[PDB]
């Protein structure tokens, strides 16, 4: 009886860690919309919101959001899916042309600068014989002067023909559920005080992820996932200064953002079935686009994040916040998309703080670009059409992406700059819970029975 | 070892239970293992990876004694150099997640012995039919 006999069991619950390609899914209301008014509405399978999960008792798996897969997959898929909604669109090959630009009709102040140029140019008509003269309004950031006369051109006339974003398709975020195929499972960590590294004591298997609205924001990640009860700072290694610190806080900070300029979309016929949507008139006042946060709740959340930052840096540490050190436009000033319109809003009023170890609203100004170079490709820019009317939107500041400066030579303080950098830090703040595992049956074990011949 | 209870008893539910108790729910993980302009290629290769993995596991079973038993016994004895531990301290103490690591090194030594014993039993059966 002390001789045991081996038995192989099929259907054994045991998994290894694996790397597979998850597939996209949308909600049934997201599956309800059609005709590619958003991206890829019929390409993904419909599913429920908050997909079904069951809890696993007495189990402990070690997680790591930093060496995690499927943030690479989501980054690659969102880049490629961004590209695939541009092949039916219109290339601005005939618009790379000499722009005769004068100032906008406005009370010009010689100290400041007009941020709009009224540019007239020859446009090819729908007939290949006749050309017309048409004007438009551009921003300073989209045109550059080529070398009396004052003729300009676009900044991307020497790198690419610039694909117009189609005004039919919208750029609003709709939640993706990343579903696993057969044989694979997805584990979610329900632990409260879990920094995304090491053993999670409370996991649950789930077939699809929860809803991930794709937001594109460099600093101050918007409409994210709130923390449970306190602010949680998350980093791969704190003492490394070239790692970003992802700060997720509990109650969100309400931000309002607006362009108060009432615009006139005007159509220009390029060729047969080719339309360019330009700016017509500025109906009314020429005002500057901006954003508001609440002064009191922003001071409150900064006190909360300093309270949580003093756990990794000692109690007697002076924590101060300064603005970004430099770079391109959309790594220093916080970018977003307020309904088909790309804002670049100055954060110098936000990160202006110092913290000792003892009804208002912040206005912060914005710039607007019409042509963009998303993900810094070699030859793919994107014109974005103007949209009608005053544009306002409300959002939730969910977290921050901070970066500590290279503190040396007896740093009594430690300072923190905002910084966007890679988009994957935006994507790692939503897939920090989940991992994907390979379920492997056919366990093998001894028991006291020989097969009867 | 099964009783009356109304909870769902779902896929990977008893992954943390002891392996004498997860053996009473093995048809659940066996069931939820197969069924679940460019993206159809990705979905399609995921589906054929799923059916290929299922066929590989069913082929590993089929060249052994059990083809559809889901619990089968065989004629190779448990070499005590493999795990050197008692019978009482596996079925009431450890899980399959923890028993997987303890014989992962001795895996693929066992599978060749399983195929060897099944081929020897097939030729013994053929000779026993042949002498009659």
């Amino acid at each position, epitope marked *: 009886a002390e001789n045991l006999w081996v038995t192989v069991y099929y259907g054994v619950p045991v998994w290894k860690d694996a790397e597979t390609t998850l597939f996209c899914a949308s909600d049934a209301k997201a599956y309800e919309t059609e005709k590619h008014n958003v991206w890829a509405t019929h390409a993904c399978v419909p599913t429920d919101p908050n997909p079904q999960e069951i809890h696993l008792e007495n189990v402990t798996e070690e997680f790591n959001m930093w060496k995690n897969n499927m943030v690479e997959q989501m980054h690659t898929d969102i880049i490629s899916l961004w590209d695939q909604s541009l092949k039916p669109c219109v290339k601005l090959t005939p618009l790379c042309v000499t722009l005769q630009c004068t100032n906008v009709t406005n009370n010009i102040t010689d100290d400041m600068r007009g941020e709009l140029k009224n540019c007239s140019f020859n446009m090819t008509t729908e007939l290949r014989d006749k050309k017309q003269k048409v004007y438009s309004l551009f921003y300073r950031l989209d045109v550059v002067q080529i070398n009396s006369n004052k003729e300009y051109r676009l900044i991307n006339c020497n790198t690419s023909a610039c694909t117009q974003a189609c005004p039919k398709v919208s750029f609003e975020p709709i939640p993706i559920h990343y579903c696993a195929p057969a044989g694979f499972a997805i584990l979610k960590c329900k632990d409260k005080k879990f920094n995304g590294t090491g053993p999670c004591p409370s996991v649950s298997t789930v077939q699809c992820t929860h809803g991930i609205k794709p937001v594109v924001s460099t600093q101050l990640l918007l409409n994210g996932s709130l923390a449970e009860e306190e602010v949680m700072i998350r980093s791969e290694n704190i003492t490394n200064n070239a790692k970003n610190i992802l700060v997720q806080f509990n109650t969100p900070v309400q931000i309002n953002c607006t362009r108060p300029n009432n615009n006139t979309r005007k159509s220009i016929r390029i060729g047969p079935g080719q339309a360019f949507y330009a700016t017509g008139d500025i109906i009314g006042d020429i005002r500057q686009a901006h954003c508001n946060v609440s002064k009191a709740t922003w001071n409150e959340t900064l006190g909360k994040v300093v309270k949580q930052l003093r756990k990794h840096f000692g109690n007697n540490t002076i924590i101060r916040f300064a603005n970004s050190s430099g770079g391109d436009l959309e790594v220093t000033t916080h970018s977003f998309n307020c309904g088909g319109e790309f804002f670049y809003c100055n954060t110098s009023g936000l990160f202006n703080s110092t913290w000792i170890s003892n009804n208002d609203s912040i206005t912060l100004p914005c710039r607007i670009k019409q042509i963009i170079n998303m993900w810094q490709r070699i030859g793919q820019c994107m014109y974005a059409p103007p949209i009608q009317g005053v544009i306002r939107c409300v959002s939730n500041i969910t977290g921050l992406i901070l970066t500590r400066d290279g503190g040396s030579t007896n740093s009594t303080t430690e300072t923190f700059r905002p910084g966007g950098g890679d988009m994957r830090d935006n994507w790692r703040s939503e897939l920090y819970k989940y991992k994907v595992v390979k379920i492997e049956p056919l366990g093998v074990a001894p028991t006291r029975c020989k097969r009867r011949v | *070892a099964v*009783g*009356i*209870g*109304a*909870v*769902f008893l*779902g896929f990977l539910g008893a992954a943390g239970s002891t392996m004498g*108790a997860a053996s009473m729910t093995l048809t659940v993980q066996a069931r*939820n293992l197969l069924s679940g302009t460019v993206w159809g290629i990705k979905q399609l290769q995921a589906r054929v990876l799923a059916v290929e993995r299922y066929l590989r596991d069913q082929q590993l079973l089929g060249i052994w004694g059990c083809s559809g038993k889901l619990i089968c016994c065989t004629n190779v004895p448990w070499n005590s150099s493999w795990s050197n531990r008692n019978l009482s301290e596996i079925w009431d103490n450890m899980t399959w997640l923890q028993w997987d690591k303890e014989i992962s090194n001795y895996t693929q030594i066992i599978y060749g012995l399983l195929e060897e014993s099944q081929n020897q039993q097939e030729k013994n059966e053929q000779d026993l039919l042949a002498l009659d």
Partner: antibody, heavy 117, light 113 residues
Framework: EVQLVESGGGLAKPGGSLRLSCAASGFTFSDYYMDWVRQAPGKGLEWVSRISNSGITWYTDSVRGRFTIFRDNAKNTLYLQMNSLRAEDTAVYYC???????????WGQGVLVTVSS | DIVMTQSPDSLAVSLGERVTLNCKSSQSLLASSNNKNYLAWYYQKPGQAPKLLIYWASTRESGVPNRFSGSGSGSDFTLTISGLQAEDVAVYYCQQYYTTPLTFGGGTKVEIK
């Protein structure tokens, strides 16, 4: 005909301990899962624990290994031991019998536990 | 976890006419394998141990007469009464028993107006 009659204690200092038992008459303990469900005074009912036919325990995520459940199949009773009591444990406790269709098929009478000094 | 939310907080009606109550779930409780759904509709009197009314999200318990109906599948569920009695006017509950932790509804206290 099947009664689940409970016993134990009701008077406990905050930060203490108590053991609550449940005898049952009407069925066999060999094949039925047991539960423990509490109700706060004026608030909703809530689940605490569940035990299998052979001793596989399931706990809610607040009792976190402070409460244990032991079902003496020989002495035909169900046991809930409470170590390191908390002030929010003042409730009425119930042992139930589970059917295969819905849990809480039959219902214990309750023990009013007041964790107060 | 799974949040079970009952849509009204109370319902004070007259006696004799029908009513209806709803319980929404934060997660679809419809088991795809069994093709059957997981609600326990309970009934607790004042000062009494509760009893089951509806199991498998549709089926009445023995001892319960024909005047109740558990209805609906998927994620949103409906307990419809056909005739109100004086024995019935106390708290109803909805319970998911699909996973651990077993969570209940808020409790709609139906009384007489």
């Amino acid at each position: 005909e099947v009664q689940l009659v409970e016993s134990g204690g009701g008077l406990a200092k905050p930060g203490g301990s108590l053991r609550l038992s449940c005898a049952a008459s009407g069925f066999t303990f060999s094949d039925y899962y047991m539960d423990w469900v509490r109700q706060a005074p004026g608030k909703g009912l809530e689940w605490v624990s569940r035990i299998s036919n052979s001793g596989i325990t399931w706990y809610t995520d607040s009792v976190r290994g402070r409460f244990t459940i032991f079902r003496d199949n020989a002495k035909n009773t169900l046991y809930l031991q409470m170590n390191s009591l908390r002030a929010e444990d003042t409730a009425v406790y119930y042992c139930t019998k589970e059917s295969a269709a819905a849990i809480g098929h039959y219902w214990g009478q309750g023990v009013l536990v007041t964790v107060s000094s | 976890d799974i949040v079970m939310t009952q849509s009204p907080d109370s319902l004070a009606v007259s006696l004799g006419e029908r009513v209806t109550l709803n319980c929404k779930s934060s997660q679809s409780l419809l088991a795809s394998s069994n093709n059957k759904n997981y609600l326990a509709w309970y009934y607790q009197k004042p000062g009494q141990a509760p009893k089951l009314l509806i199991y498998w999200a549709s089926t009445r318990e023995s001892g319960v007469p024909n005047r109740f109906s558990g209805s609906g599948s998927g994620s949103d569920f409906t307990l419809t009464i056909s005739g109100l009695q004086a024995e019935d006017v106390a708290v109803y509950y909805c319970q998911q028993y699909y996973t651990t932790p077993l969570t209940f509804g808020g409790g709609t206290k139906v009384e007489i107006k």
